[PDB]
Symmetry: D2
């Protein structure tokens, strides 16, 4: 007597991106055509105020739901500012191949040509697509299906902000879904990370590189209890002499230091001079995404060679 | 006769001593009378305010003479955009200043430095380069210092502007396409002629679960200005906002930039009322250059904000 | 004291409608007054009025319509009651109309071309914001003298540099090499002024013309031939634009067809199928009057070639136009 | 021991005898080569494509060939690369390479391009990736790449699909494409001497039906239309396309935009004016020629356009 449709659960982390989560759901009635949609409010914060406590709660809830036969896929609604941080964390900690799609809107729900309704519809379409199984955590905005591993927010305000210059999208939407790429990095069900038994994460802070910078921010991070530091270096993870003094001091005090880049794209490569002093390379992870992997790495090991190996596979 | 172009070197060679650079690209002799000097010799992460003052003063002196038609500065790529934008605000001439580097070492297969240097000299000597602002020339592209950034760690095509494109491109001949709308060079209100140091400005990065303690440390270290590389449109966590508000109360100017890479950071009523300023379309490290220079003129947040909308 | 902005509607997706709100590629036809009433916020930034010029999908915009549109725009901008114009148009051939107007509008007052990638009925339809922003730009004092502009997705592109780069996405209109004249983030941020001659400063007028010289476009590919050149000449082409591989390159067969067209008095311009970059002069091709399209893609090169042929058949004068416009 | 990499040259040298020009290659491969043809890339034709695919298929069947590099002019490089992606029945790497600057120019890009092409062709992880295009430290799929700029060194790109990988000293593989290719395709051309004729017609304002009519008269078996936007036709172009279909020609609507998918449109699909998916006109031509070696059924041809 009923139409068979996928069971998609929306987990909201902030306000409504289209139009409570119950209403959010009624603002995009088109979703009923393609899913049996249900919803829950996890937390309710602006994305700059998403923190490690919330991430642990969110990953645990997703893992619980996806283990059930009554949930086919999940859509997480989230503020765009830090969406990429949450999406990549879930990419490393969700231990299921069922789809998890993270979505937001660049224009408020009340704005002229608000982008939330289409984004949400498309997120639910992807989350219920059989072919979305096994693709890793996905970010869906503006008719594009991006991997959490490769995507970033590239522009402050534009609808088309989430992109990957060098890796493009997993797929795109033009009425139908077109899947184009599968990523090569390890993810989701295949990672070595679990947050099932964790109530906190190792502290990791980020320091920026620039002309005439110093060592004082490294020293402050160490004093504040950082277990890891990601440095957003100029170019290919480069450090001034002052920054390198700070990084070396941190390493000597037992902090793991990973060199990322402030440029936005490309790989940070191992460099003999840096590698021999355990100033690690972030691969193609930007500073905030490198932080997520470093926190998780530090739950498993303090060995710099093992952490570097994670940065090449995840 | 040909334009007289002076090369000021700040690092190692990008092609083939400053005499070595010139000899490595003999083709330059057909488009300019090239001479050169070594200003400093450092990796670009070690370019600092002292060096920038020296470089700006030397450039301003040289461009005032009739024997110099234009200048090329050879520089490491990592912080090239910081130096280029600083010079865009402090060189008080319409004569061309072109910043150039290479992404591959001069000894590598298919080294890019020889072409880059040749093109930089071609642009520096082009009459239509007059009045364009400071330019950055790599990989057949002519970018404004105001809009360009290094977007990729290692690729030859790294210097770009997604939203503003290039001032021009080269395909044998130079094709000039755009003139920027921001105030620059000859028309700025900044002078560093008599300065021996610049107001200290530090940069703090925004991220989930960040804090106030890095703001506190920058203030303790003597920052006069702080640029915050905020997520999205210059957004702050509650903790970051506590740190920023603390800094403003201690007389530090705080400018919100973005970590995203592109777009404008807009004035936001909640932030603006608390003097947490907006960086416009300046990224953190370029915002830092304008904030340092603004602080040579004023501590008034409304005046500093107006500079961020015009420069 | 608000600017007086006239909307001239021509058709396109922005005036299209489907009964399914989730259809972005299938749709049926909305009137200019409906477009306006759908965006009441416009009343706070302009005094808006509208007229329907034509009502067609943009692949059916033709030279007759362009002439009508350019003449109407020129007459309206001569009045003190009109501060700026917005043209609503289908996206498919928007760049052709925009660049034509960039060469034939004899005023420094703003002309902004706008469309949408989703129909008016779609969820998160993009037309309302695009239209608001087009009106905002057309009424901005700083938009004066910028050349014809194309406004979609919070971006303000020059007609000379923009193209439709994607079949279906909202962010399709871009210039990889030249970027945008400006962008919108609440306020307008003007960033660039183009260097090419435009609008009031061109040598072209269409005030006395009822038709344009026929120009056709031929595409380059492996195993192509001469017979499509021959067919374009037979069909009455006065000019041909060749969308060559790479930097306006021709196969031997294509070069045979081009050379035969030139011998019959047709002007041939080499453009590129790549999408970006400059088609440079080439000594061997220039000696045979196979001209270079500069940074004009095939369809935009066609617009300039048609107007050049209203002034001259001299290949050196035509080439000079391609370098300045 | 090092992989055995064979270089098939189609024209002039892109570097500098290549081993002399780029001696670093000796440390990463045992290189050999041959001059299979000697033409400018605008004059690569169907006869040459068939010769190249037959020769590559033969070579890769040998146990002592680990991978192939083809040096090729950049203008039509994407056409050859995609054809080989559909016809090389092996998982071993085939890498197509060119240079945007002449070998004699300042900062010639060919030496690095060639070195990287050989590095990729010998990399174990390049197996099963489909035909690759390697220029400017980037590793692009033949299925997604195009030449996007007339003259720049960074011209080969895919805005929407990115690269299969990139090179920064080491190779970083990032994506595997989802379309069917190489070892898994249903196309076999080793015994064919010609391919069904396919021509391309451009869409623009004030276009007509005359070019369609001429292509049909010239013997086209298929026509790719480089339509404005999402494979759109003017009324005049549509009349020409419908005339062609009635005369037994298969018509595929591609796009002149450069990116995105051309979607099936009900009114066009009802009339067998097919959709090219995310294939540009010149790449859609290669798939249509091969489709026409198997069938004239428009539904089957459309299905090929959705999978390849
Ligand atoms: Na450097
Ligand atoms: Na349309």
């Amino acid at each position: 007597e009923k139409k068979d449709l996928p069971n998609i659960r929306i987990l909201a982390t902030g306000g409504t991106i289209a139009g409570g989560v119950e209403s959010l759901i009624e603002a995009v009635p088109e979703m009923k055509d393609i899913a049996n949609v249900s919803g829950e409010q996890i937390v309710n914060v602006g994305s700059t105020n998403i923190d490690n406590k919330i991430l642990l709660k969110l990953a645990k809830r997703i893992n619980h739901l996806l283990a059930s036969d009554d949930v086919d896929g999940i859509v997480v609604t989230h503020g765009t500012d830090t969406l990429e941080e949450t999406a990549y964390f879930l990419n490393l900690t969700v231990k299921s191949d069922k789809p998890v799609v993270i979505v937001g809107s660049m224009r408020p729900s009340t704005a002229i040509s608000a982008d939330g309704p289409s984004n949400l519809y498309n997120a639910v379409k992807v989350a219920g697509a059989p072919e979305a199984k096994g693709k890793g955590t996905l970010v869906v905005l503006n008719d594009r299906i991006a991997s959490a591993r490769y995507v970033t927010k590239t522009n402050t305000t534009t609808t088309d902000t989430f992109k990957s210059e060098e890796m493009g999208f997993v797929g795109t939407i033009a009425d139908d879904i077109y899947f184009n790429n599968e990523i090569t990095r390890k993810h989701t069900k295949d990672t070595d990370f679990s947050v099932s038994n964790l109530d906190e994460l190792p502290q990791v802070d980020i320091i920026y590189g620039y002309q005439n910078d110093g060592s004082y921010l490294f020293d402050a991070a160490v004093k504040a209890g950082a277990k890891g530091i990601v440095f957003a270096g100029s170019g290919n993870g480069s450090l001034s002499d002052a920054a390198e003094k700070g990084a070396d001091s941190a390493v000597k005090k037992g902090v793991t230091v990973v060199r990322s880049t402030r440029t936005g794209n490309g790989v940070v490569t191992p460099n003999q001079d840096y590698a021999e002093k355990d100033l690690l390379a972030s691969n193609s992870l930007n500073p905030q995404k490198a932080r997520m992997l470093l926190m998780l790495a530090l739950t498993k090991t303090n060995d710099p060679q093992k952490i570097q190996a994670y940065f090449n596979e995840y």
